[PDB]
Design a protein around this ligand. Structure first.
Ligand code: CL
Length: 346
RNA sequence: UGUACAUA
């Protein structure tokens, strides 16, 4: 009987099994639930460098079969860890040619991510050179975008310029990505980690179709990232557009969170623009702020106003709202809405 | 009273 069946049979009868006993059995061990667990704990607990190197020729030899196995991918990942550094380069050579494929696969993509987490920049670049061939499809992929996000988080900004130039490959790409459940994560990481040199054309593209992206289920998270990570002029352009169209932005499901984000990240003079738009006369109608507390989404925006502004800015909101407090008591949740405001009408 | 990602 092969060593694995023997081992799975009576685990405790084999308590002196070592990695150098595995030899040819590596591939079957690594694809086995029990066997892969054995290798893993051996690789982590052993303080013998030569035991650890023993199975490595087999890992390399079977790399293609292992990287996308439910149990083998962990064995390959062990050799991308710190302290196995002496192996990173030849492990990378064993998987390099199929990186374009591995990036899309649910198990192999975890190997690519661990490698990007650990290896030195020259090897990170070698892996990115393969990603380049499939980058656009990769960014919209449930698995592919995790490798792209990891690249952006771990590689020097200058070596992911090809990812930014993909976001800019054609007019509608930034829009296409920002409204993708996976592409939007890529745009966010770019806003977090790229140089302002690199993010400015990207943010520019986002501004051109701002209204659409801001009210999208995924784009609203991209605009929020622009608010937190773009420039002062970006925040200014956004607040200004938000204030001129305050009621339409606040009464929609996704764009309402964008106003909340302006209130949380804005300087005092941006907050003032939003308070002023909300307390504006409009002779022939209730002030905007009052209409906003009657609304399923906008009522959270008004609450965020009251909590994020100065007492001086709150004064105007209190004076504008207070007449209308009884009428607002009627509509559904209208009670509970001013409940959480009774601390400012005390 | 209101929004988003992959393993045993
Ligand atoms: Cl354009």
């Amino acid at each position: 009987d092969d060593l694995l069946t023997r081992y799975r049979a009576n685990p405790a009868m084999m308590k002196n099994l070592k990695l150098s006993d595995i030899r040819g059995a590596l591939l079957k061990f690594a694809k086995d639930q029990v066997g892969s667990r054995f290798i893993q704990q051996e690789l982590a607990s052993s303080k013998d460098r030569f035991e650890k190197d023993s199975i490595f020729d087999e890992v390399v030899s079977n790399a293609d079969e292992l990287v996308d196995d439910i149990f083998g991918n962990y064995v390959v990942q062990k050799f991308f860890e710190y302290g196995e550094e002496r192996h990173w380069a030849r492990l990378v050579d064993a998987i390099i040619d199929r990186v374009p494929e591995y990036a899309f696969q649910m198990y192999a993509c975890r190997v690519l991510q661990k490698a990007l987490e650990k290896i030195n920049e020259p090897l990170q670049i070698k892996i990115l050179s393969q990603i380049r061939h499939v980058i656009h499809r990769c960014m919209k992929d449930q698995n592919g975008c995790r490798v792209v996000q990891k690249a952006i988080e771990k590689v020097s900004p200058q070596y992911v310029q090809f990812i930014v130039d993909t976001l800019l490959e054609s007019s509608n790409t930034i829009y296409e990505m920002s409204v993708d459940p996976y592409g939007c994560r890529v745009v966010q990481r770019c806003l977090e980690h790229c140089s302002p040199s690199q993010t400015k054309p990207v943010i520019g593209q986002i501004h051109k179709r701002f209204d659409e992206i801001a009210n999208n289920q995924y784009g609203n998270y991209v605009v929020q990232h622009v608010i937190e990570h773009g420039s002062e002029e970006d925040r200014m352009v956004i607040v200004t557009r938000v204030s001129n169209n305050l009621f339409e932005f606040a009464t929609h499901k996704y764009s309402s969170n964008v106003i909340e984000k302006c209130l949380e990240q804005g300087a005092v003079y941006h907050k003032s623009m939003i308070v002023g738009a909300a307390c504006h006369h409009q002779e022939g109608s209730v002030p905007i702020v009052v209409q906003m507390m009657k609304d399923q989404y906008a009522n959270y925006v008004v609450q965020k106003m009251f909590d994020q502004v100065t007492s001086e800015q709150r004064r105007e909101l209190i004076l504008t709202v207070r007449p209308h407090i009884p009428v607002l008591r009627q509509f559904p949740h209208g009670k509970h809405i001013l409940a959480k405001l009774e601390k400012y009408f005390q």
